[PDB]
Ligand binder design. Sequence first.
Ligand SMILES: CCOCCOCCOCCCCCCCCCCC=O
Ligand SMILES: [Fe+3]
Ligand SMILES: [Fe+3]
Length: 222
Amino acid sequence: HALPDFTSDRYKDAYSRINAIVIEGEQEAHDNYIAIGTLLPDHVEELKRLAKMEMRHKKGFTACGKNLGVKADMDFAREFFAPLRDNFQTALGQGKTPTCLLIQALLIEAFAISAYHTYIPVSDPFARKITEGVVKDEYTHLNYGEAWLKANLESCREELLEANRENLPLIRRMADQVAGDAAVLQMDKEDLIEDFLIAYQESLTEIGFNTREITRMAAAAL
Ligand SMILES: CCOCCOCCOCCCCCCCCCCC=O
Ligand SMILES: [Fe+3]
Ligand SMILES: [Fe+3]
């Protein structure tokens, strides 16, 4: 806390959707951290700094698409995120800070970390430097969210178990929907799943969940 042919129509086609998802994910991260600031007004300056970070990342990932001569399929990306975006919006409107934090700071960050770690060894030299820069910049020891959830665990255990039950399957469906395009990019779905589960288990351990609790939570993916 072998390399694909980056110039082929097959590669560019799959990249148009993967690149769009990463770009949209970064925009949504910016919007979510600002929204979280309305729930945690004393966290506004840290959340503004984290939102500026994600926008820097959005620009770097936009340049990855441009460098390969690929037009990002933004409509596909907006639809890909719509279920999780809807649940974040519902929790936000209800003032459900633990749900908002689990979605953004835990699920989405672990999803991003796994994607970046899996992509790095199979990426083009331009995108590799951008992605490595993004991982060597997803940072505090604990996120605004480990740290707030670690500090507030006793008041929000049941909501966290509910948020996980509702949102972890959405993350699994997202991984299923993009597995084909990820394989075109020479990424193995099993590596993505393994890295996500490890990153998510690490965050849950840090927050104060025990092994049995984590096992039951990870099982909600099915
Ligand atoms: C239940 C296992 O779920 C496995 C999910 O594995 C991750 C597969 O994701 C590959 C698609 C790439 C999407 C990257 C998301 C970018 C979000 C960046 C937002 C920054 O906080
Ligand atoms: Fe990011
Ligand atoms: Fe992030």
